[PDB]
Amino acid sequence: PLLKLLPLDARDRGTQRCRLGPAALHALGARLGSAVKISLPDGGSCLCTAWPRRDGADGFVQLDPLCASPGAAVGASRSRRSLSLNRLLLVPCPPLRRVAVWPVLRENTAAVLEAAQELLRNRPISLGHVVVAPPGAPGLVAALHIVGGTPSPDPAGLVTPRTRVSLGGEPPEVPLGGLSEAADSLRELLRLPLRYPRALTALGLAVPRGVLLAGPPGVGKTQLVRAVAREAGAELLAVSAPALQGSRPGETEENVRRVFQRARELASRGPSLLFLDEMDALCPQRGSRAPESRVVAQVLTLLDGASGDREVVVVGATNRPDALDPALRRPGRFDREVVIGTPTLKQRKEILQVITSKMPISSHVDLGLLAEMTVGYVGADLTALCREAAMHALLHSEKNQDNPVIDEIDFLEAFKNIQPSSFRSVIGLMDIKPVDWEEIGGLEDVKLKLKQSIEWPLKFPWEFVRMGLTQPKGVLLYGPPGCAKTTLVRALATSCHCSFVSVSGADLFSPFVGDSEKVLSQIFRQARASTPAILFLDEIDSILGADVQERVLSVLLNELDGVFNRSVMII
Amino acid sequence: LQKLLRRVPHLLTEAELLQLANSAHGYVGADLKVLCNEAGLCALRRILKKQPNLPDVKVAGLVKITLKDFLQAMNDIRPS
Amino acid sequence: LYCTFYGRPYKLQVLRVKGADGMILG
Amino acid sequence: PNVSWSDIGGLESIKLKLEQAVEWPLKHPESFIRMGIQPPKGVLLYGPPGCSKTMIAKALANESGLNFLAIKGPELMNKYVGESERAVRETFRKARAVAPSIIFFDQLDALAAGNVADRVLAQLLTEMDGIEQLKDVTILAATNRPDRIDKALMRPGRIDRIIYVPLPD
Amino acid sequence: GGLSSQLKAIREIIELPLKQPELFKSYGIPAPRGVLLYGPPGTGKTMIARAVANEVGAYVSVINGPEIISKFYGETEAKLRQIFAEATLRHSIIFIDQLDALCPKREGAQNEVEKRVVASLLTLMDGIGSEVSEGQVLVLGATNRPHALDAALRRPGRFDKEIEIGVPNAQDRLDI
């Protein structure tokens, strides 16, 4: 005989009551309140008490799962499954003398023990079962796991007001490559404020607590912090807030201090991280609203406050790194920066090999040609290129549907109608192509003078200073157009094996560059960050404006002066 | 360093603080403090590699302050 | 059906009831 | 468009010179690596004035399957402040969208009012550099005077080959 | 008249789902949601929306553009939502026409019905993915100038497929 399943009423919610008809109670031979074990259709089982329906009609079953197998709360009845009667059993309940529970508490020992006695008072329970607290219950225990008992609750049993309750305990995604170089630069900072049970209170200070991530829009900045997240616990209150303000002056400064209040509340025995995103915050035509960045300043001040109290790490991600507040950048709230650049030719192949691994693409597909043809893209557009080449190989297809053959015909078809991302052709580009010294014909004496003033002072620094020779603090090369000045600088960077920050004048003509005093300060800071380095300013007459003229000269003249191997050469 | 801090135990605390003063020839005040940052939290490191895992309230009770962190802190901190 | 929403009387006419066993009316 | 080579006169030497840049990098790229040479990309035509140069560009697009998109010369400098820059980039997106296409740009000497000529030279240079690697899109330009052509547009990845179109013999 | 390549793509895109979502998860991709149609004004985008709803057969929910502009306060967040899953019910194709009304991108002006209706669509379309019960929601956006649709409305999961309906040629005007 088959019985239907119906959703429970508002009076059976959290009462552990099973509503049966009279013929099923005659067939089971049960009294009122006797224990019925229900073997569920989608695995697992539950334990309930038998109570009759008011209507007297037979053919229907309702059930409320409170004592359940873990992950077996499948008693929702949208599809209206039917249960057979062979799945309900009448189970004898001896009384118990000792239980063993493991509690799951909400976000001392005596209050937890008192809340366990109060939940489990006069109930039938079995072994390996979760007892779930009803909604609106007083106290702090959210769940209990049943571990053991001395009259052995394997065919279950009844807790009594005079039983004993004891506490034991035994509870038995895209990897994204290409950011490997910067993923561990993050850990050499943030691992030391994750192994802190007030040990750095005892011996030390506090490495910074205020990091900043920058990069082009599409290199996967938000997914990197979720990867460093899971990597070391943490609940990442990822407060984005692109428009959290309003018409009132600073009405969300009360709101962000409650955001910052639960940074402390969720700081006991566990890591936490405040993840401010899109600190972009557009540029209003008129003066930005006071509350907009004042609270920032509050966030600033608040942040600088986090130093006199319990110290919570803040990782911020912005898109365009310049035109921030200059009172951030000073030692404190925000002084350690990790820069994620546009991808090179090398790991763009390993960007592609991560995405190619999940899809069934056949072995007759190039990678180096797919890396080389895709110059100008970011990591978001390479996923959509591999999304679109899956679609035109499902779009057009055959009738067999057993061999997923994706070939080079529809990768080149999907290359055609995907537009490339902007905000790449700017700032400064390292890595270009290797040029040897033998490609430049003639000019033997100019090669000797360039070697004696920039490569010998950056490669052999002890023998330069012991012989008593000065380092020239910035050279200038001038001549007619067409006599290999840019080739001689690029041959010098290959033999030096150093970083190469190059700014040209044709980079500066783009309208996406914001006013270029702070692009010129961004170039000097990325240089002093990367160590032994060559800063190349090609076409300085276009940079200096052959007003904004006098302001540019000034940011340049002040940086040219204020500056075991160091120093930045300016060519 | 007499008024170094007078706290933060072990340290050197011998008569061979004269040679680091001789050594002393760069800048002060705000660089030397961060020498305490480059000797306080930089004296661990080597403790956490010789043992795999421990509660860090016992690592702070067994902290050792060495001579060898001072020479590398000269290379990391350049006063003026 | 009759309900008084803050003094205003409402007249409701029931056209169709669909219940928990899936059987609808006319 | 419908102009054949026989309507102009069958200019056989200018037929082979234009086919060496728009069809020979695709069909026979082995002969370029056999001789040790980079493949040319952009082609400038110079000569005496008239409508002779715009009919050769229409006749080249007729014999191969090739689509034609035309940008004028001194029209675009005289126009307004803003989205003539957007009209340049919407021409370049429509060339890559459909199929191997020829972008015809008109008189080049008029570009070479300090801020007027330079925001359009910036948008032209940052998008012609996007089709340096793509072999199916070719830029084709016609000018009257080879003297007042800017040397920024004469680098060996952007415009290489110079062909003289004479008065007929 | 004309558009024989581009309407055949719309029908093949609007038929594989609702019928066969097993083929999409056979290879490597989720079943997509956002079909964005655009063109110059006067081309046939609103007629090709009404053409799809006359053939395939579902509940079709049409939300207009210039009549959810003004209101009095934030009544969009009750109206949109109800509109969505309500259709969710008929397991359904959701039409949004004149997308540059509901959402601009005009930062200078900071309007009250502008800056958080963008959070009313990105956080609704990221939750309309019905993977608890494996439902199918298709959003067809039609706009006259998708030049000013935020940069955040082109991300995957959201509006992804963009089909261009351009000005007709001489062979197309013959068939018109």
Ligand SMILES: Nc1ncnc2c1ncn2[C@@H]1O[C@H](COP(=O)(O)OP(=O)(O)OP(=O)(O)O)[C@@H](O)[C@H]1O
């Ligand atoms: N190694 C990778 N590098 C870059 N992008 C990747 C990589 N692997 C996957 N992606 C793609 O990037 C997406 C992540 O986008 P994400 O939201 O993190 O961008 P974002 O850079 O934070 O954006 P925004 O600048 O708007 O804040 C993934 O869903 C995937 O499509």
Ligand SMILES: Nc1ncnc2c1ncn2[C@@H]1O[C@H](COP(=O)(O)OP(=O)(O)OP(=O)(O)O)[C@@H](O)[C@H]1O
């Ligand atoms: N001596 C030389 N040997 C070989 N190639 C040379 C020589 N001089 C110039 N070239 C070639 O000239 C071309 C242009 O050189 P490059 O752009 O480096 O310098 P430039 O014209 O002086 O630069 P700019 O105009 O920006 O000042 C390159 O293709 C280079 O190979």
Ligand SMILES: Nc1ncnc2c1ncn2[C@@H]1O[C@H](COP(=O)(O)OP(=O)(O)OP(=O)(O)O)[C@@H](O)[C@H]1O
């Ligand atoms: N391809 C076509 N064949 C026949 N009639 C057409 C065609 N395209 C448009 N029409 C005519 O245009 C009418 C609908 O206008 P249409 O769909 O072009 O709107 P629209 O002006 O493009 O809209 P929007 O203002 O949203 O940009 C049809 O009723 C019909 O009269």
